[PDB]
Design a protein around this ligand. Structure first.
Ligand code: PEE
Ligand code: LMT
Length: 485
């Protein structure tokens, strides 16, 4: 009853519809396309242009500040951009089908790049719309319903699309149908609620760029929260990186069985776990849910440790995969809720995109290290290390209880006034490190244009990441000292 009420309310359907519209764009630019172009034997000539469509989704934060300042002529900051980024995908996705892959491959690639760029903006504005309107109690269930819509969109965009195209309809008509299925999405955008008009908006574009950073870094506890955001998901990334390879080699299973088992059980478990986490969060506070969910996520992948020693069996694999996926989808909703709470209403999506990118910066480094650890200590000890690698996230969450308990009851963050002498040094060092990484990115994009070549590529990135880590460590230590005193 009280746990059930959330589903009947009409805004839930709008959230799901707007979620499915994010998926239909993701697979009509990289995956169904190649399947279409396999008739024309996609070459290496167009990959130079085609390298950007995958890249728009990773680098969305840089063009994000433009979204908050600007507004469409009518409809307010967050319900006008969704009408503008859901009318452009429709004019391009259908048209793209008008082209012929015989002699217009470059035009097709350029249209794919434009479609990806539009989808990135729609995604960021939709995240801002989610964070602005949703109240304090229902955030987890909203995130779960959005994830369910996302998955139901990706599945329709790939599977049923391929089946229809190669059975009845044809490729051009499959593209036409994937274009025409966006009309309900724009209807839902038009009929959805809006953020209030009380909240102020930045007056200058440079102000839009600079204000969110000064607002987030002028908090009582900022560096500790940054460290928690970075280090929450390590214990899941480590196991998810090589679970498939372990199930292939260390146990003795076949590729098809592993693929099928993942492709069904992982989806079902993730969906059920996310919805359960949202329903339970609807009545439970943020900190207790975060702690319990983190402990469960850390203790989940001991099933893999049990599997590694014991001999092969189908049901053991099924149970372990089901449990791991349920615990992961269970904690992902709590993490999304924690990300959503911190940002303030006025500058929402810039502070959401930067935090989301900082969340995913963890997966880049763990990859090669996961490779080295296996040859060092066998398959089995790797998973014990995975179990023990979730301790820092729980410890940081335990230390940072005060701010999360105060925010729920006061709905605002206390400004920083303790130890004002040492924060400037850390901020300046972090700025210098980010500037160094920007210089490295400029060097990489200068080299990739074949205008010139540089021999200083990896060392600059290593130095910059070392400087950034040192700055964040100094900030965290100073914050801990201030909290103790
Ligand atoms: C409804 C609103 C929609 C808003 C967005 C619409 C965008 C439509 C079209 C945009 C085309 C943008 C072209 C930019 C060209 C200049 C930049 C460039 O060439 O960067 C290259 C460089 C490296 O590319 P490769 O060499 O292929 O990488 C190889 C890696 N191994 O690119 C990158 O590093 C990342 C990609 C670019 C990220 C975004 C750059 C900034 C934004 C550009 C366009 C968005 C609008 C900006 C202006 C807004 C105000 C008018
Ligand atoms: C200094 C700023 C922060 C660091 C910037 C450089 C590192 C960026 C993070 C590491 C690279 C991976 O970055 C991450 O890529 C995945 C790729 O699917 C993106 O994935 C995204 O997929 C779709 C895109 O519409 C979203 O619905 C989803 O929520 C999101 O995760 C993330 O938005 C991005 O953050």
């Amino acid at each position: 009853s009280q746990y059930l009420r959330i589903f009947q309310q009409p805004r839930s359907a709008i959230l799901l519809i707007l979620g499915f519209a994010s998926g239909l764009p993701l697979a009509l630019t990289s995956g169904t396309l190649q399947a279409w172009m396999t008739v024309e034997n996609i070459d290496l000539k167009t990959i130079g242009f085609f390298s950007l469509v995958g890249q728009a989704y990773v680098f969305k934060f840089l063009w994000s500040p433009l979204m908050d300042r600007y507004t469409p002529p009518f409809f307010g900051r967050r319900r006008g951009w969704l009408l503008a980024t859901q009318i452009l995908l429709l004019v391009a996705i259908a048209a793209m089908g008008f082209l012929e892959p015989g002699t217009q491959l470059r035009w097709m690639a350029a249209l794919a790049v434009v479609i990806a760029f539009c989808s990135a903006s729609q995604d960021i504005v939709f995240d801002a719309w989610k964070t602005d309107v949703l109240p304090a109690e229902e955030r987890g269930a909203g995130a779960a319903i959005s994830v369910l819509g996302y998955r139901l969109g990706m599945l329709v965009s790939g599977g049923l699309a391929l089946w229809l195209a190669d059975k009845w309809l044809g490729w051009q008509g499959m593209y036409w149908l994937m274009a025409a299925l966006l009309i309900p999405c724009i209807i839902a955008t038009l009929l959805a609620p809006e953020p209030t008009d009380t909240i102020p908006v930045p007056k200058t574009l440079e102000q839009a760029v600079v204000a969110p950073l000064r607002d987030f870094f002028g908090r009582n506890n900022a560096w500790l929260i940054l460290l928690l955001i970075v280090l929450y998901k390590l214990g899941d990334a480590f196991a998810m990186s090589l679970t498939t390879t372990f199930l292939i080699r260390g146990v003795g299973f076949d590729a098809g069985e592993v693929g099928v088992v993942n492709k069904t059980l992982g989806l079902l478990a993730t969906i059920v776990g996310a919805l359960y986490g949202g329903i339970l969060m609807q009545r439970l506070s943020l900190f207790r849910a975060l702690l319990i969910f983190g402990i469960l996520q850390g203790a989940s992948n001991a099933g893999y440790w049990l599997l590694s020693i014991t001999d092969k069996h189908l049901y053991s694999m099924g149970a372990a995969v089901f449990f791991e996926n349920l615990c992961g989808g269970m904690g992902t909703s709590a993490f999304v809720a924690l990300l959503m709470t911190l940002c303030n209403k006025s500058f929402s999506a810039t502070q959401f995109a930067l935090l989301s990118a900082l969340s995913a910066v963890g997966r880049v480094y763990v990859g090669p290290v996961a490779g080295w650890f296996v040859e060092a200590h066998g398959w089995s000890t790797f998973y014990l290390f995975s179990v023990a690698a979730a301790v820092p996230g729980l410890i940081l969450l335990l230390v940072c209880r005060q701010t999360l308990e105060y925010t729920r009851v006061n709905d605002n963050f206390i400004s920083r006034t303790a130890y004002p002498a040492g924060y400037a040094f850390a901020m300046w060092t972090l700025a210098a490190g980010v500037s160094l990484l920007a210089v490295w990115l400029l060097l990489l994009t200068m080299d990739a244009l074949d205008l010139t070549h540089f021999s200083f590529l990896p060392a600059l990135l290593e130095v910059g990441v070392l400087v950034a880590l040192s700055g964040v460590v100094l900030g965290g230590l100073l914050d801990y000292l201030a909290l103790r005193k």
